[PDB]
């Protein structure tokens, strides 16, 4: 019941964290207001708990403008250490599997990750929302096509 | 835009530990164990450099999913390669679905702005790249307000 496998290459991932971040109001709202003003395409956003970093992906072509905008928006917090230094990881890619609806993603998730793990492809981040039946994984850009191939063999 | 939706009575599991960065296949093991248990995983997020994984299940599946995790990771938990499983109950997932353009630019900003204005704490976020939709995990107590205020902003 798989729809398709998609890949977006040449992405960069930002990760914002800090000891204060659990205690600060509207941190995601500020991050994404800053990206919106800078006209930056935020393709993936993930935060696994209030204590862990907010991570988000942008196309590599937007990476320098996004970093400058993040440094501007969080200047005070960074200088004071409420936020740890911004983490920027370049040369990434996003592989996604699209279901045909929600129900059958159970076997699909297990199979998707099993294929990547068999290929020894490191997963840098994961995002699956509750509305679309689709799972996105962030990998190193050099692994993108191999990741599509092994996922395709497993699922089709 | 296309809609604002709500799932109540969710539980969120978080799997964390030194072994998450450097052991092969940890997400594969988590989701094989959920699959063997016939437990639908409605949300997944992994965001930190320490590679902790969080995922949500319906509250009715919480006891069986906890047992499946304890069985799959029995040896890593005993060795301390994984820290004790974290389990948060009484959660809701609010999702916004947009149209076909990269509209989440204005959408994701305003959605998070509406929740912050309402003083609604965010428990987890997941937005994949293939859908124009964004899901946010909140306390179940805040779900009805969170939806009302995100309707007000984005409509």
Curated annotation (Swiss-Prot), chain B:
Name of this protein: Bifunctional aspartokinase/homoserine dehydrogenase 1
Region Interface: start-end pairs: 1-155
Function: Bifunctional aspartate kinase and homoserine dehydrogenase that catalyzes the first and the third steps toward the synthesis of lysine, methionine and threonine from aspartate.
Assembly behavior: Homotetramer.
Part of the whole protein covered: 306 to 460 of 820
Homology family: In the N-terminal section; belongs to the aspartokinase family.
Organism lineage string: Bacteria, Pseudomonadati, Pseudomonadota, Gammaproteobacteria, Enterobacterales
Miscellaneous note of the record: Aspartokinase II-homoserine dehydrogenase II and aspartokinase III also catalyze the same reaction(s).
Tree of life domain: Bacteria
Domain ACT, chain residue ranges per copy: 15-89, 96-155
């Amino acid at each position: 019941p798989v729809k398709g496998i998609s890949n977006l290459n040449n992405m960069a991932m930002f990760s914002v964290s800090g000891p204060g971040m659990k205690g600060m109001v509207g941190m995601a709202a500020r991050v994404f207001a800053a990206m919106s003003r800078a006209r930056i395409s935020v393709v993936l956003i993930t935060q696994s708990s209030s204590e862990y970093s907010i991570s988000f992906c942008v196309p590599q072509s937007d990476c320098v403008r996004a970093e400058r905008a993040m440094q501007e928006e969080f200047y005070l917090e960074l200088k004071e250490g409420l936020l740890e230094p911004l983490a920027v990881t370049e040369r990434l890619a996003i592989i996604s599997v699209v279901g045909d609806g929600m129900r059958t993603l159970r076997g699909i998730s297990a199979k998707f990750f099993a294929a990547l793990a068999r290929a020894n492809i490191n997963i840098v981040a994961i995002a699956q929302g509750s509305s679309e039946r689709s799972i996105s994984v962030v990998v190193n850009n050099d692994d993108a096509t191999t990741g599509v191939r092994v996922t395709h063999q497993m699922l089709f």
